[PDB]
Amino acid sequence: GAAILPDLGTEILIPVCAVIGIAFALFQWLLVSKVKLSAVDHNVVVKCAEIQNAISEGATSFLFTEYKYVGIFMVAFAILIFLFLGSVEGFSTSPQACSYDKTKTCKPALATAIFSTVSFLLGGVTSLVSGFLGMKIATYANARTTLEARKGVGKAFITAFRSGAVMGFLLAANGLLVLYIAINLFKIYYGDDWGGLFSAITGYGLGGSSMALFGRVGGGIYTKAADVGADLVGKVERNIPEDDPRNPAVIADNVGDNVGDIAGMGSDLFGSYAESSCAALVVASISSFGLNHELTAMLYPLIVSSVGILVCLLTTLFATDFFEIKAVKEIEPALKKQLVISTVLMTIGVAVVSFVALPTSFTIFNFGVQKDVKSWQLFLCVAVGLWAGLIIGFVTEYYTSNAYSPVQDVADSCRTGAATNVIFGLALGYKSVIIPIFAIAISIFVSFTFAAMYGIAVAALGMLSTIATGLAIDAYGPISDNAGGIAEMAGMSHRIRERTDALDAAGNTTAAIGKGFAIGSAALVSLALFGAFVSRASITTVDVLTPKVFIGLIVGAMLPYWFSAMTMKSVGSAALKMVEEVRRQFNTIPGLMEGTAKPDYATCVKISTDASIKEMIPPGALVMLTPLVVGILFGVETLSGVLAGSLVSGVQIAISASNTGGAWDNAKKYIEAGASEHARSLGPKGSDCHKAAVIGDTIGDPLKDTSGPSLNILIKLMAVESLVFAPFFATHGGLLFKIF
Amino acid sequence: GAAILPDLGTEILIPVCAVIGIAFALFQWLLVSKVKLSAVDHNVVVKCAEIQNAISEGATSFLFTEYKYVGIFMVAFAILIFLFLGSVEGFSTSPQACSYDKTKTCKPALATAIFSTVSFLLGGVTSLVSGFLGMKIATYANARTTLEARKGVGKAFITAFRSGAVMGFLLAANGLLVLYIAINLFKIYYGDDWGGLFSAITGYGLGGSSMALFGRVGGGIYTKAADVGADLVGKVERNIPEDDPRNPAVIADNVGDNVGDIAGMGSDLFGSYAESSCAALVVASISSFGLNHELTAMLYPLIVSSVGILVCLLTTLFATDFFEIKAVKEIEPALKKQLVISTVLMTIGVAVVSFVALPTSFTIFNFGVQKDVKSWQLFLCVAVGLWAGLIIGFVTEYYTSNAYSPVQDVADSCRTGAATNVIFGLALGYKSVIIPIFAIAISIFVSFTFAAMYGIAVAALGMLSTIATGLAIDAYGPISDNAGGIAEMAGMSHRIRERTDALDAAGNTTAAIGKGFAIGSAALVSLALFGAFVSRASITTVDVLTPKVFIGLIVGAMLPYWFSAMTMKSVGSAALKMVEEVRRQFNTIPGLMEGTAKPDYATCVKISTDASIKEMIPPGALVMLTPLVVGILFGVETLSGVLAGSLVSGVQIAISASNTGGAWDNAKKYIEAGASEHARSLGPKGSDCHKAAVIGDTIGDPLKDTSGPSLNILIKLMAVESLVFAPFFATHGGLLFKIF
Ligand SMILES: [K+]
Ligand SMILES: [K+]
Ligand SMILES: [Mg+2]
Ligand SMILES: [Mg+2]
Ligand SMILES: [Mg+2]
Ligand SMILES: [Mg+2]
Ligand SMILES: [Mg+2]
Ligand SMILES: [Mg+2]
Ligand SMILES: [Mg+2]
Ligand SMILES: [Mg+2]
Ligand SMILES: [Mg+2]
Ligand SMILES: [Mg+2]
């Protein structure tokens, strides 16, 4: 049956909401443009502008290099998709019978081979745009945040958070609008073949996360090579302030925050958004909505996201206008209130959407059978994901913010040296997985029971329904990070750096929270896609206790470690190179230490450019090739094992790495700020305790910024890729078992 | 039908081989006893004896205290076993139809509740005895190895390997003799009910690992708190040598080697042997061997172990009599040759056993169906496991010896400080998992295919078929470790410490290898036990894509991390206390640093005794309570997920933790030896590079000696524990799904 909301209404609502989100982003960017500066005190304003330009040049320069390689890889890979999907039916142009209804005829498999290539390119391009737009706002807002900090934390908070919101609303609205357009264009061809339409559309998320993979790892090695190098020689060895302009690695470091923590993260969360929508859509496409051609219900996920944009617009206003921060201890709770407000409002929003966009009863495909499902049960599916998110954010804050005992004990353990700092930091991360896993598990059980793979997918989307706010609170952080870097490079008052340091500590926590959301929604969407892959591969049963599934399971569980071995070694090796270079400059450039000679920033930009562009290739290949190699050699049953294994295993290492890194960073921040008797007694800056904290912080650097966060991409990427190639693996795969 | 070897012959063979092994172990003890020393140069000899006595009292004192608690828990848990298994058939005394053959009549389930409790205590007791005996020989041989070091590497090597072999042959022969005795005693009651017999016998492994769990964690906490504290204050802060008699934590440290690395490890591997034998037995008891009451073939696992002892005896002779070590570079090669010789001899040994102790055709239970299997296939099952082991050994040496580039690169990375040393160490560990996992997967495929759970179990036994040599090369390590500590504490010459340092570094590699076999065999025996649990709980299929199974899977995967969090945080905190204590004495005891006054060793023994006894409980609780809680509250479907997930996840963190810790240690020894130019380039002792290596080494201490090697126990324990309580879970479990 049709829903309360008409098909034509849905067709208007979605693009109108995207347009509202884009408008909001422009308006915010407009307000941020009010903070004036130019490279033509007035001294401090000119210096901030010059530093900003150095950073912006470097960041724009690296992405162009990275995106050139990735773009090339994207074109090659898109050719594989066309070939492999095309070969399933020998590239025939003959229409065949609908796999979901033998009484109807569908468009040739060749059409979907073509349109999967088209949507894959759409997603990859949108993914690149998402990250590039993010970089362009961050590299614009960084120094405006610095200048605003002269007036106080609240003013600087506002411009950093407004700017983060610029990225969030652009990314969420652009991602929605592109998806909506692609669906409508594809529909012109598919007509009534909604199964094929939406099966082709799943390339969008494959493209999204494919580009995201290289974006996260490439940017990740770039930034961390610089970070670790700058910090160890500057802070640990030569006893100078963090981000000192004498330090040759500082420009690369701050460019790094934009290239990794911003551009990479943007592409990454886009991949999340794209895959979840696409996952909800394919399952619906052969459920009652798709079979009965009911557009409003079919596009329920896009209606959920449309309303999410609106709810986040409102929520944003609380931190942007209705409240002002006057004290440092108000920052993290401000950020947290963004989560709390958006969740409570979105819960209402989703109730409304579920009331008017869904018929009260319908069926969801469930491994061959149409399962009876009620609209209130579907509301619980998206709401359990939405709430799992918040729980995850709360626990993550507790484990990464220096307002709480876990991180303060990590800082306190520095009193006995770096070895105890690291033992405590590792244990913290390990311990932190427990409640998010329980939350994920509860999410899976409810959504699975109520509505199978559709329910689970709509739970992932629910966790990502407030993505504009999520990106805002997250993008806020590297912008605040640069702001302090520019503050120090511009020789500003110590009072400025203290303010930026407060903002930056909050960003460390907010970044950990963002990783929590990525890993959570990744676990959810990957399960859904895995389930869909099983049907699409004509697997009757994924039975753990078969040789083929089990060998897949144990090898799948090892992939996240193989992947982490590569990325850790890359950072370690580039970092070592970076230390040698920074030492060489301090040791042989007359007056560098004196501050009467300028350092060579370009060489450090070069060390991390060379390492990242080269070393992003093997882990990208590990992830992308695995489904193809396992699928073609071992078959769909073994790929099944591999999907379940890498999901349940990858999730643990992802969470503990991101949180351990976060903890070390904020433990260091706590010693740096000395804002309590306990903190002061670990100080001052330069003390053996501080240096021990720096050691932990830098070990945590690759953990939380290269390997850890990329892991959620490994997991979600292999799942879409597997679903997309499913018919090709089913038909032409499992060779090793066929020759024998 | 039946085999070449008559049941009488089997009944004679098995204890004969055990007694030979016990005999051999005693013989080697005599030879070692030829090295003379007494407490109440010969003055150095008296010192060595005074120190040995301190260590001996310490180790004995702790084991008695630890065993007191474990033994109590052992009694309590046995009460649960009886109660729960008893409660299935309502404690009836009447016979019932065989669980495996409705047509036949079987002994009452209550008999089985009783015999399971007997075999449990039998196993719990033999586990403690395995550990205590190891501790006795180690704490005897250590100062004897020290003294023989006055005559060169080769001499001290022999008395160290001989002494290790005493532990290996005693534990191997004793575990076998007790199991044999128990099967025969149990058979008196059971008669023709072999199902119930070997189903009762499986408690033996449950007992072994249960008691091993507390010994590994208990000892592991005791030893690493001392080790971290001693090394940090002594080496990094006070610039004194490792094991310096001024350092109040040195006696606790050297006691620790015996209490953890020997006693816990002995119990640990006893559990492995026991579970693997029992797992092979339970599947066999409902296969053609057990149905047709063919005793020889039924005891094929025990016949393999029997020949295993003989093979190992022969093998030991190559290291003890046939060859002599002249150069330190010969140590590791001698140890590795022990693995190669035994693997080759045992391959022939198993061929022979398969040819005489098996019918050419038989059937193996296979999820409800008799599966036709040929004896040349059972041969391949044990062999794949035997060779996977060797492979694992070769790979583990590659990533943990300082004679190869992985460890050498890690040491090299110390030039840029502790942060890069730790980053490289983490990466090496992650990297190391790949080939062992492949080894494990290949074994699983081959063994699963040929003979289902029986093959998998027989592949676990194959990997442990040379357990005597394994324990030998491994127990050699901590003996050498103590020997260097006694050298330093007795103030012997640098030439002496240098010789033990070389033995010790080899011991480091040898210990990582032991961990390999533990993790490898644990994966196999757990998968087998998992499969038996599935049948025993009347599960039709373990479907990954069901709400019940998947929440099990993801949660199960989280548990190894939860366990690692507890055990790392415990060492971290105890170590923090230890450091403060050592500093206290150095700072407030006059003439202590100068060597005029005695340190109080007892305060450090107390910190670590207090920490371990207290902090071993929650991890034990987590592992023991988990099957009960999930089985009772959630049901056998979910417990199935928990078993699969903790297996595939646990193994990754177990291999990487042990190998990372192993690497940091040997990188440190590498610098301390200075036996190459590269090595010397990072020295001398006390350099910034050495200190950064010590940082990595002490971070590695809790990874490789507390959490890491205990994880193999976590996995294998939950597997047998689930199998034993399966009828109880199937009948009275799944409460949450029953009430709602
Ligand atoms: K940050
Ligand atoms: K050792
Ligand atoms: Mg930094
Ligand atoms: Mg940064
Ligand atoms: Mg920074
Ligand atoms: Mg930070
Ligand atoms: Mg950092
Ligand atoms: Mg030590
Ligand atoms: Mg030791
Ligand atoms: Mg030692
Ligand atoms: Mg060692
Ligand atoms: Mg140690």
**In chain A, what is the straight-line distance between the N-terminal and C-terminal CA atoms, in Å?**
51
**In chain B, what is the straight-line distance between the N-terminal and C-terminal CA atoms, in Å?**
51
Q: Could A431 and B562 be called an inter-chain contact, meaning their C-beta atoms sit closer than 8 Å?
A: yes
Q: Which of B432, B524, B554 to mutate to test the interface with A (most CBs of A within 10 A)?
A: B554
| Span from the CA of B396 to the centroid of ligand 12 (angstroms) | 18
d(CA A88, CA A103): 22
Distances (CA, A) of B46 to A52, A529, A638, B36, B511: 72, 71, 64, 11, 31
Q: Which of A235, A444, A545 to mutate to test the interface with B (most CBs of B within 10 A)?
A: A545
How big is the CA angle at B558 (ends B552 and B559), to the nearest 5 degrees? 90
β-pair partners for A369: A366
β-pair partners for B106: B96
d(CA B660, CA B656): 6
The answer on whether A610 is annotated among ligand-binding residues is no
Q: Which helix (H) or strand (E) holds B370?
A: strand B370-374
Domain boundaries, chain B: 1-740
Q: Which helix (H) or strand (E) holds A145?
A: helix A109-148
CA A505 to chain CA centroid, Å, is 20
Q: Could B232 and A640 be called an inter-chain contact, meaning their C-beta atoms sit closer than 8 Å?
A: no
Rg (CA), chain B: 25
d(CA A333, CA A316): 14
Distances (CA, A) of A702 to A226, A398, A612, A710, B649: 11, 22, 13, 11, 22
Closest CA–CA distance from residue A720 to any residue of chain B (Å):
17
| Span from the CA of B256 to the centroid of ligand 9 (angstroms) | 7
CB atoms within 10 A of CB A72: 10
3-state SS, residue A104: strand
* Closest partner CB to B228 (pick from A419, A442, A640): A419
Distances (CA, A) of B377 to A548, B279, B351: 19, 18, 11
| Span from the CA of B244 to the centroid of ligand 8 (angstroms) | 12
* Closest partner CB to B702 (pick from A423, A441, A699): A423
Q: Hey, what are B579's tokens? A: 């450091």
d(CA A358, CA A361): 8
Closest CA–CA distance from residue B155 to any residue of chain A (Å):
36
DSSP calls for A589-643 = STTTTTTSS---HHHHHHHHHHHHHHHTHHHHHHHHHHHHHHHHHT-HHHHHHHH
Taking CB atoms and an 8 Å cutoff, what residues of chain A touch B551?
441-442, 444-445
Tell the burial category of B360 from Cβ atoms under 10 Å away from its Cβ (0-12, 13-18, 19+): exposed
Breaks in chain B (C–N beyond 2.5 Å) sit after 40
* Closest partner CB to B427 (pick from A557, A568, A695): A568
DSSP calls for A235-276 = IIIS---TT-TT-TTHHHHHHHIIIIIIIIHHHHHHHHHHHH
Q: Identify the closest residue of chain B to A231 by CA–CA distance.
A: B419
Strand segments, DSSP code E, in B77-165 are 96-98, 101-106
Q: Identify the closest residue of chain B to A448 by CA–CA distance.
A: B547
If you ran DSSP here, which 8-state letter would residue B149 be given? G
CA dihedral sign of residues A329, A330, A333, A334? negative
Tell the burial category of B79 from Cβ atoms under 10 Å away from its Cβ (0-12, 13-18, 19+): exposed
| Span from the CA of A509 to the centroid of ligand 6 (angstroms) | 8
* Closest partner CB to B551 (pick from A236, A445, A653): A445
The answer on whether A231 is annotated among ligand-binding residues is yes
The answer on whether A268 is annotated among ligand-binding residues is no
Q: Could A441 and B568 be called an inter-chain contact, meaning their C-beta atoms sit closer than 8 Å?
A: no
| Span from the CA of A258 to the centroid of ligand 4 (angstroms) | 9
Known binding residues of B for Mg(2+) are: 227, 231, 257, 481, 508, 665, 701
Contacts of residue A78, defined as CB under 8 A and 6 or more positions apart, other chains included, come to: A117, A120, A121, A124
* Closest partner CB to B553 (pick from A424, A560, A648): A648
CA atoms in the 13 A half-sphere facing the CB of B44: 17
Phi and psi dihedrals of A96, rounded to 5? -130, 180
β-pair partners for A101: A98
d(CA A623, CA A206): 12
Q: Which of B649, B688, B711 to mutate to test the interface with A (most CBs of A within 10 A)?
A: B649
Taking CB atoms and an 8 Å cutoff, what residues of chain B touch A665?
none
Contacts of residue B98, defined as CB under 8 A and 6 or more positions apart, other chains included, come to: B104, B105, B106, B193, B195
Q: Identify the closest residue of chain A to B577 by CA–CA distance.
A: A416
Q: Which of B381, B445, B568, B682 to mutate to test the interface with A (most CBs of A within 10 A)?
A: B568
Q: Which of A238, A412, A420 to mutate to test the interface with B (most CBs of B within 10 A)?
A: A420
Ligand nearest to the CA of B667: 11
d(CA A89, CA A92): 6
Q: Could B649 and A644 be called an inter-chain contact, meaning their C-beta atoms sit closer than 8 Å?
A: no
Q: Which helix (H) or strand (E) holds A213?
A: helix A203-231
| Span from the CA of B505 to the centroid of ligand 8 (angstroms) | 12
Q: Which residue has the tokens 């347009």?
A: A19
Q: Using an 8 Å Cβ cutoff, are A708 and A661 in contact?
A: yes
Known binding residues of B for substrate are: 224, 704
| Span from the CA of A393 to the centroid of ligand 4 (angstroms) | 21
CB atoms within 10 A of CB A355: 15
CA dihedral sign of residues A662, A665, A668, A670? negative
d(CA B553, CA A530): 14
3-state SS, residue A3: coil
Tell the burial category of A153 from Cβ atoms under 10 Å away from its Cβ (0-12, 13-18, 19+): buried
Closest CA–CA distance from residue B578 to any residue of chain A (Å):
10
CA A366 to chain CA centroid, Å, is 29
Phi and psi dihedrals of A234, rounded to 5? -60, -65
Q: Using an 8 Å Cβ cutoff, are A505 and A389 in contact?
A: no
Known binding residues of B are: 224, 227, 231, 257, 481, 508, 665, 701, 704
d(CA B403, CA B405): 7
Q: Using an 8 Å Cβ cutoff, are B308 and B469 in contact?
A: no
Residue A690 amino acid letter: H
Closest CA to A446 of A435, A467, A428, A462: A462
Q: Using an 8 Å Cβ cutoff, are B209 and B126 in contact?
A: no
CB pairs < 8 Å spanning A and B: 243
Q: Identify the closest residue of chain A to B453 by CA–CA distance.
A: A545
CB atoms within 10 A of CB B344: 15
Alpha-helix runs per DSSP H in A490-590? 494-536, 547-556, 559-588
Q: Using an 8 Å Cβ cutoff, are B569 and A427 in contact?
A: yes
d(CA A86, CA A109): 7
The method of structure determination was X-ray
* Closest partner CB to A551 (pick from B445, B545, B568): B445
Distances (CA, A) of B570 to A66, B218, B608: 44, 11, 10
Q: Which residue has the tokens 């590297």?
A: A478
Q: Could A645 and B648 be called an inter-chain contact, meaning their C-beta atoms sit closer than 8 Å?
A: yes
Q: Identify the closest residue of chain A to B231 by CA–CA distance.
A: A419
Rounded to the nearest 5 percent, the helix, strand and coil shares of chain B are 80, 5, 15
Closest CA–CA distance from residue A236 to any residue of chain B (Å):
9
Taking CB atoms and an 8 Å cutoff, what residues of chain B touch A664?
none
Phi and psi dihedrals of B592, rounded to 5? -75, -60
| Span from the CA of A485 to the centroid of ligand 5 (angstroms) | 6
d(CA A543, CA A548): 9
Contacts of residue A219, defined as CB under 8 A and 6 or more positions apart, other chains included, come to: A62, A66, A256, A259, A260, A261, A263, A264, A612
Residue A528 amino acid letter: A
Distances (CA, A) of A293 to A297, A368, A455, B560: 9, 19, 19, 47
Rg (CA), chain A: 25
The answer on whether A600 is annotated among ligand-binding residues is no
Closest CA to A123 of A44, A202, A46: A202
The answer on whether A569 is annotated among ligand-binding residues is no
Closest CA–CA distance from residue A248 to any residue of chain B (Å):
17
With both helix axes pointing from N to C terminus, report the angle between B636-673 and B547-588 in degrees, rounded to the nearest 10.
30
